[PDB]
Amino acid sequence: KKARMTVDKDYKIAEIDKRIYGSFVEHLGRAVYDGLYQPGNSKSDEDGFRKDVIELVKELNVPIIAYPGGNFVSNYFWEDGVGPVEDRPRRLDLAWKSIEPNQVGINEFAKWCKKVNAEIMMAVNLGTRGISDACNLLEYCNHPGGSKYSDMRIKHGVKEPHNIKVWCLGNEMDGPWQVGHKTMDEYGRIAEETARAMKMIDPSIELVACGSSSKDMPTFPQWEATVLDYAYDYVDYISLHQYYGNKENDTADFLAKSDDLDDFIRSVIATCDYIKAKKRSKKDIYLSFDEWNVWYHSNNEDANIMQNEPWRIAPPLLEDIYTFEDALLVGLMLITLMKHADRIKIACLAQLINVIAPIVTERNGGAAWRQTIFYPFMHASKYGRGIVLQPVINSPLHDTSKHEDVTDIESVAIYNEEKEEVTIFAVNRNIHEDIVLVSDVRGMRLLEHIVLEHQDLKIRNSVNGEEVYPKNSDKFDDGILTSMLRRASWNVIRIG
Amino acid sequence: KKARMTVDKDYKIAEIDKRIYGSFVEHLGRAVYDGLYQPGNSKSDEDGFRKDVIELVKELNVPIIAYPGGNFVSNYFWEDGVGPVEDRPRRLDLAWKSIEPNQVGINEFAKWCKKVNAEIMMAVNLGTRGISDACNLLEYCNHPGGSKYSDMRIKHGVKEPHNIKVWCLGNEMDGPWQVGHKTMDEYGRIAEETARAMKMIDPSIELVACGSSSKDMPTFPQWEATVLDYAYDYVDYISLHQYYGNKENDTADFLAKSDDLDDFIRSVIATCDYIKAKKRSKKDIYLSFDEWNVWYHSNNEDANIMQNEPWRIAPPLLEDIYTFEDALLVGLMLITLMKHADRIKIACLAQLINVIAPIVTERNGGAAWRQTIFYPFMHASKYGRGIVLQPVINSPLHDTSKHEDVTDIESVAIYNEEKEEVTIFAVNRNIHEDIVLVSDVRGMRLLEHIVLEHQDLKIRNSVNGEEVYPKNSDKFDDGILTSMLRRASWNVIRIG
Amino acid sequence: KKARMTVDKDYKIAEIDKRIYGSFVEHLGRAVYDGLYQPGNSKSDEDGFRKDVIELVKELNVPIIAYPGGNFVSNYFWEDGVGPVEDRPRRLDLAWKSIEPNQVGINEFAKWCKKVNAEIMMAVNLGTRGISDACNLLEYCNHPGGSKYSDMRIKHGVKEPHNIKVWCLGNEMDGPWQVGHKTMDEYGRIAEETARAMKMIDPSIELVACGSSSKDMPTFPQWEATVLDYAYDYVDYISLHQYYGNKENDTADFLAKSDDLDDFIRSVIATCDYIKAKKRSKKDIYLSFDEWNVWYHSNNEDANIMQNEPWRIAPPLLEDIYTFEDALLVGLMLITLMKHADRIKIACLAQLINVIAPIVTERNGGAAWRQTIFYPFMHASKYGRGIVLQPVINSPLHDTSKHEDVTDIESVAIYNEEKEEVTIFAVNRNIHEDIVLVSDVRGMRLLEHIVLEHQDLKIRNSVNGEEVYPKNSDKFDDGILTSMLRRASWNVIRIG
Ligand SMILES: OC[C@@H]1O[C@@H](O)[C@H](O)[C@H]1O
Numbered sequence A, B, C: 001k002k003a004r005m006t007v008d009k010d011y012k013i014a015e016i017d018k019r020i021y022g023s024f025v026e027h028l029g030r031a032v033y034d035g036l037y038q039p040g041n042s043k044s045d046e047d048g049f050r051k052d053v054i055e056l057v058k059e060l061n062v063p064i065i066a067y068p069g070g071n072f073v074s075n076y077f078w079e080d081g082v083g084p085v086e087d088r089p090r091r092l093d094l095a096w097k098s099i100e101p102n103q104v105g106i107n108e109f110a111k112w113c114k115k116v117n118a119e120i121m122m123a124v125n126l127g128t129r130g131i132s133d134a135c136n137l138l139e140y141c142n143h144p145g146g147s148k149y150s151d152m153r154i155k156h157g158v159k160e161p162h163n164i165k166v167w168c169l170g171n172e173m174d175g176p177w178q179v180g181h182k183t184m185d186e187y188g189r190i191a192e193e194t195a196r197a198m199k200m201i202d203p204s205i206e207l208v209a210c211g212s213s214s215k216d217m218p219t220f221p222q223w224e225a226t227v228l229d230y231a232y233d234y235v236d237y238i239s240l241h242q243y244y245g246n247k248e249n250d251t252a253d254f255l256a257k258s259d260d261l262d263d264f265i266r267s268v269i270a271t272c273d274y275i276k277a278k279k280r281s282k283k284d285i286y287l288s289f290d291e292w293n294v295w296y297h298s299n300n301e302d303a304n305i306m307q308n309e310p311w312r313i314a315p316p317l318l319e320d321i322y323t324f325e326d327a328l329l330v331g332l333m334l335i336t337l338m339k340h341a342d343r344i345k346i347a348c349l350a351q352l353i354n355v356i357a358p359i360v361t362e363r364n365g366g367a368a369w370r371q372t373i374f375y376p377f378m379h380a381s382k383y384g385r386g387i388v389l390q391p392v393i394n395s396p397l398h399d400t401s402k403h404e405d406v407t408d409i410e411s412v413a414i415y416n417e418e419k420e421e422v423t424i425f426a427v428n429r430n431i432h433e434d435i436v437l438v439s440d441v442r443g444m445r446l447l448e449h450i451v452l453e454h455q456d457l458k459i460r461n462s463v464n465g466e467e468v469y470p471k472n473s474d475k476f477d478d479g480i481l482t483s484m485l486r487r488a489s490w491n492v493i494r495i496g
């Protein structure tokens, strides 16, 4: 019933990179078609983009969105979605057994990223395509003009290069669910050669190599070690993916799963450093956590679609509707990323619109509303820029079904020297007792205390209204912050 | 002198899959051009199909034809043979050093197969091509509409998809004569990834993975083990090829070679089950014997043609003229296929028209006639449907030049329970003595005794008449079927 | 002081294959643009070729020219250099961060070769292309007509086929500087497979399989051994590459490096001879030294142009200005080449025009002079055809700073039956002492004694005049020819 913290200006971890507040839009389900893109609609601008979703994306201050996949890219032909809309084929999406009409291509989605204040992180097909087609698209997007593929982009109606900064070398081809699945050695070899060639057209890009699909894949972490061994001198990040679920209806254990995520991150970092010594590089690989969220609800009601109503345009796939306990994990995941901002410099909540998303529109026409997990993300993206200070913490301990010695309070401090604030994110994973948070701010006044709490852990939102929203609530003395955090609650504490 | 077997319904091996009476048409020699396709011929038709040869293959009751190869497939670009006949190019067929004019392509051949009451078994180029092009072809042939390659078939004049059921992942790439030769690991991976992609486009197809070119390749059967190791979960058959020849003028030995065929089949079956163990799979790989015949006569004039007379359209390649003794071995092989109907479920007599074939058309508008091998095949495909009874047999033996303890009689009884008939296929491999076959038919009225004999082993057929042809002949008490099998004869004995 | 050598028509070594006097034009810097092709210059013929450079090439008696690369070929798409010049696209050359206008293509450069009395040695792209694309280019060039890619060459204005006699399977793909770099086993297999299919199109070509980029690559000569182990049956040569430089400004050790070149060649022959035993072959693989020259001068100014003036057309890359000592190493190299005429049957001075070349043009206009190195290549190419006689030479020795026991006088004798000449090529790597070469000719009147000397080792040529040029100088009784060889001199002594 007591839990104490030391925070210390003079004791850094790293400076947060704003691209850990990134997200992700795949050509999956309704993410694009009647998601961000709804042409004739009364809520959509001239270009066909819904203006109300554009606003909700903007409240999340997302600086970077991954596109277009995801399993999708592994058999995507980027040429299909550029040029005259009349001349674009309908193609089979083998990943999500639906049909892709390809009205939103590179140029269309590059425009929507303007309107939401975000850079693209582009994924090349390394599944059924390779080196030279990754080069072409890089030439199309980044070369100013005067060559076959740059001029083709100008002719298509975009005179200035998109100048895309970060690229993913294909997408998690280690799974058996994946068109053009590759072995460690096959991918390490191809990621290397594609990295080498792409960096010859545009030496200012950064390239992400695909890590394991999940830490439960038998080949993790040898996949990482291998891939990196091949391509160390030509890449800048290794990617990680993790989704959690609560099909076990074990809220206590489900909230303990951010400890698996901490161990996962530490394992990938170990692998990197290991390969480093093997190469005697002075470089560090950074981490691109370009897929994370909660995802378990819509599992059964996606199997029905593919295939008994298959090859639909834009079927309602992966349409998870998130509960309160879910947003508790998201916050715990954000907090765990922030504790690792020294090697995680890019992260993507998967995904942004409709498909396991914080934003949702209703089917067949629209509405637009905030899921439970919108707000923890928002608080993180807004008050979580600056410097991360070490979690010098002692807090109570509790065990759960399949987890022992779980901290009752995860929390970290982010110190923005610019705005002379220190924001303290904290989550109480004790579903039962309430625990108060002493905080030895060896600083150098309390500014506010936002909170997200609820009685019913299974409570969802809906088009019809928000059951979960930041209620400014609660209650700091000498330079000692005293704050109380209810059983099972998300908390942002602020100081001026 | 006396050979005995007991024949009991309650002792089965399997049910015959009618697909073991299939054949094969390659873009080889005069098999298509100056064969089944002769556009301005009086005997021909609306589509250029010789109607006399359409009737001859109907006689053979062939339910499934592999197409278009064969070594030809490994460098074939299937789009060269579809769409506006004028726009189709002339291609070098590197395999058989011919020129392919592509006047007959997918759709042409596909509507010759209806006319002869058969279905395509489609081979995809995995020599100089790969996953993406296999998917393109599969979608073209099987996806209904509203997608690039299915609308392309529709625009091409075929409004209904061909819905091709069985597809062969390439062709025998283990040999050094193949353009695009692969090692076993190389091929095993591309077969695995193509199988996985195709089954995402159409889950109802069956896939066959390529086995060794022949049992005498030093990579046999480790090839079959490596391929299946990679592709087990996504493919349904493993292919087998076998040819026999009598270039040593030793008829006694030449007819014992069906014993070596049995040994070969058991090795592929064993290799399969071993890998089954590895994978801990409940699934059975079945055998696709998609290339078998006698083939030795024209070995020389083929070498004279390529390459002294290279790059012709429709050279007269691989035109074996078949002997009666050859027709004996073919029958001995069919019986041996039958005796393995439980694992062998697709088989292909290589090939159907003109090229090592039971049907010849003479040349430059030709004639059309049945070779000796036409007939044992017709007796098997016609009377060989139903259930195969375990050949409980004790018959005399004889050594040969290179084989020991070789049976004199080779029979298999198969039972059709709706027809209320039981047919005994039986061959006397003793080309000296005559043998009486006492068959205990555990009750259960004889219907006929068809026979294929000749005094002249090396006799042929020709356009000027048929020296070998079914002679209704011969020569059943209580329940003992006694019938006399002449030296070097093919016998089909029916009770009813 | 004195040095004894004896020739002998009886002590042979090999007939000179005139293809040891070959050269090489890459699409690199000003070799093509503002080099041999200047389509509105006052000195350029109907097609655009500077007729002064054509006359200068014709002086060098170059029978065979490698093209288009070189690193350029590893991302080249040969279709971009054929057809309407209006429709040819401009391409990023990743190799040299240049734009490729593709105004000179296969067909253009084939005409240039007629005018210089030379033939193409063609490189296919095996970095980002493969079997079927080398098959198309070989059908374009060598098939007479009546197929897709030969008819296409006809449509392009070359009715008869170029019939390219030797082809190069890719280019030095072991460096980390090259687009599409491959490993030993990758290249070994792509080479074996490409060779196998090409030789099915045109059996009369010869194929060159790439060796290492240099004798110093760690992978040397396991590369050579592995590649030949895959490709032995279908390739005909292994390539070699060596360049020299004097950045250390040690003249006498720099004239010594030809000993390293001899050692280099012997290792490769050892390696071929080892795989030959392994294969139990009766075939020898022959050596194609298709990149050799001195290269060290422009290494400063070459990086200053990339990437700081990147993506220019025709930048001044690799414009080495050759001194006199340079011409002397080039002379020894040609001697060491000729000395190995039994295994070296193709050799290319790299490169021909402006890029590390013997012929230069001044830029943005014209000029055309001869670099110092022009002259030893000229003498060798003109007087060095016939039979290389085995040299027996007792010559004095000398040490240098990093070479021990270095011949003072290096010499070799070529004998032409059709002129009973016996041209002798000798050089004095002793920059200090003068040596006289008695030559005991067991022939067989003296004809000339062309000489190449100068007292400033660092003296160059320029547009403003050649300071280094052949002087008919010097200074043969009955049996003995006596010839004084000044220090640092190249000599070509004749007999008739
Ligand atoms: O993000 C949803 C899907 O989950 C993962 O398996 C894939 O990367 C992605 O396409």
Ligand SMILES: OC[C@@H]1O[C@@H](O)[C@H](O)[C@H]1O
Pocket (backbone or CB within 6 Å): B026, B069, B070, B071, B072, B171, B172, B213, B291, B350, B351
């Ligand atoms: O059936 C004729 C040929 O023989 C086999 O070896 C080839 O696969 C096939 O094309």
Ligand SMILES: OC[C@@H]1O[C@@H](O)[C@H](O)[C@H]1O
Pocket (backbone or CB within 6 Å): C026, C069, C070, C071, C072, C172, C291, C350, C351, C356
């Ligand atoms: O001089 C030739 C160039 O330099 C070499 O290193 C490359 O092979 C080639 O492109």
